[PDB]
Amino acid sequence: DIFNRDPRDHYDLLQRLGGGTYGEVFKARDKVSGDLVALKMVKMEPDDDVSTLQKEILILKTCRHANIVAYHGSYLWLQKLWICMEFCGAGSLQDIYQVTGSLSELQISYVCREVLQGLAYLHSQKKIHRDIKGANILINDAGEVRLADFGISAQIGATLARRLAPYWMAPEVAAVALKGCYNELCDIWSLGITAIELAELQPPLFDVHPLRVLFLMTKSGYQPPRLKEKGKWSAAFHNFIKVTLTKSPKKRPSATKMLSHQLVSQPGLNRGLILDLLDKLKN
Ligand SMILES: COc1cccc(F)c1-c1cc2c(cn1)cnn2-c1ccc(N2CCN(C)CC2)cc1
């Protein structure tokens, strides 16, 4: 459900937070309530198809969970669509680690736990993020963790619907038609890679060409990556990675199963750990 009016009525546009071909992100304040919001602006011309964006909204609107970016509403005005969300002041983990350098095992553990909670919720709702990385895990000024940037999740969903227009079809073809050849457990892998990102400032093979990496991943003898420095981390951390980075999705554990893992179920994991990191931000 979409408000057909100028959002500059309801909000004040403070600051641009960056742009892409895909969208523009604005910091803004609610003129009445006074609370800060994130406003995602998308330039939608009459001719182009709106389904991709409609799917993103529907995902956001239909997700009420702590670890997923809250949605307030959306505004269609002057052929510009504004999606309104809760503000996450510290930004993404990538925005942050660029300044602070590498996170600590416990900070990583807390982040992983929080993402897993979000994923478990998403998967229960039969939704897949499919773009879990540092740059999509947002932090608020309170050190709470929020999953964001469902534009890809929306893009594959909008295609899956577009793909309606079956019996002589082969099972693998059916799987691509319905699910795209993969399942929810892809997110678990991405988390594993993200855990490495946070530890090392780069995912594995970041210096290698992308097309080449795709090739390497499809070879028979592809070994899952590990953490570079054995000694710097605990057995539980190494294992968390070993397990999340299970090559076979038949044998890779679910978000729920992962939440009971030693690393992410240990006590003392809370936002304080992240607050410590955000203090390193003003340093
Ligand atoms: C990965 O997030 C996206 C990716 C694509 C399109 C989006 F709309 C988003 C997106 C960003 C969002 C929210 C929802 N979605 C909510 N809060 N924020 C957000 C993100 C960063 C900052 N800065 C970063 C820079 N730092 C110095 C100040 C804080 C401030 C607020």
Cα(6) to ligand 1 centroid in Å equals 22
Q: Is 144 in the pocket of ligand 1 (CB under 6 A)?
A: no
Q: Is 135 in the pocket of ligand 1 (CB under 6 A)?
A: yes
Integer-rounded Cα radius of gyration of the chain? 20
Residues 6+ apart with CB under 8 A from 128: 122, 153, 156, 183, 184, 186, 187
CA distances from 12 to 16, 17, 30, 195, 196 (A): 12, 14, 7, 36, 38
Contacts 24+ apart (CB under 8 A), 226-234: 227/196, 227/199, 227/200, 228/200, 233/105, 233/199, 234/105, 234/263
Model resolution, angstroms:
2.7
Instruction: For residue 145, give the nearest of 10, 3, 275, 4 by alpha carbon.
Output: 275
- Tell me the C-alpha distance between 151 and 40, whole Å: 11
Query: Quick one: residue 214, left, alpha or beta (phi over 0 = left, psi -120 to 50 = alpha)?
Result: alpha
**What tokens were used for 25?**
């992100």
- Tell me the C-alpha distance between 8 and 43, whole Å: 16
Contacts 24+ apart (CB under 8 A), 44-48: 44/76, 44/79, 44/80, 44/81, 45/79, 46/79
Helices (H), the chain: 7-10, 51-61, 93-100, 105-124, 151-162, 171-178, 186-200, 210-218, 235-244, 255-259, 262-265, 272-282
Instruction: For residue 113, give the nearest of 233, 251, 242, 244 by alpha carbon.
Output: 244
Is 256 assigned a ligand-binding role in the annotation? no
Burial letters 122-146, b for 16+ CB under 10 A, else e: bbeeebbbbbbbbbbbbbbeebbbb
Is 115 assigned a ligand-binding role in the annotation? no
Is 34 assigned a ligand-binding role in the annotation? no
Q: Determination technique for this PDB entry?
A: X-ray
- Tell me the C-alpha distance between 234 and 104, whole Å: 11
**What tokens were used for 262?**
């030693």
- Tell me the C-alpha distance between 151 and 148, whole Å: 9
The H-or-E segment that residue 15 falls in is strand 11-19
The DSSP secondary-structure symbol of 103 reads P
- Tell me the C-alpha distance between 199 and 203, whole Å: 9
Cα(152) to ligand 1 centroid in Å equals 16
**Ligand 1 atom at minimal distance to the Cα of residue 140:** 17
**What tokens were used for 200?**
């090392």
Length of the chain: 283
CA distances from 161 to 52, 131, 177, 218, 283 (A): 10, 19, 9, 27, 48
Cα(99) to ligand 1 centroid in Å equals 16
User: β-pairing, 71-77 with 36-43?
Assistant: unpaired
Question: Strand pairing partners for 29?
Answer: 12, 36
Kindly list the catalytic residues.
131
Domains of the chain, residue spans:
1-87, 88-283
Q: Is 93 in the pocket of ligand 1 (CB under 6 A)?
A: no
Is 69 assigned a ligand-binding role in the annotation? no
**What tokens were used for 111?**
């982040």
- Tell me the C-alpha distance between 122 and 126, whole Å: 6
The residue nearest atom 24 of ligand 1, judged by CA position, is 91
Cα(198) to ligand 1 centroid in Å equals 18
- Tell me the C-alpha distance between 147 and 149, whole Å: 7
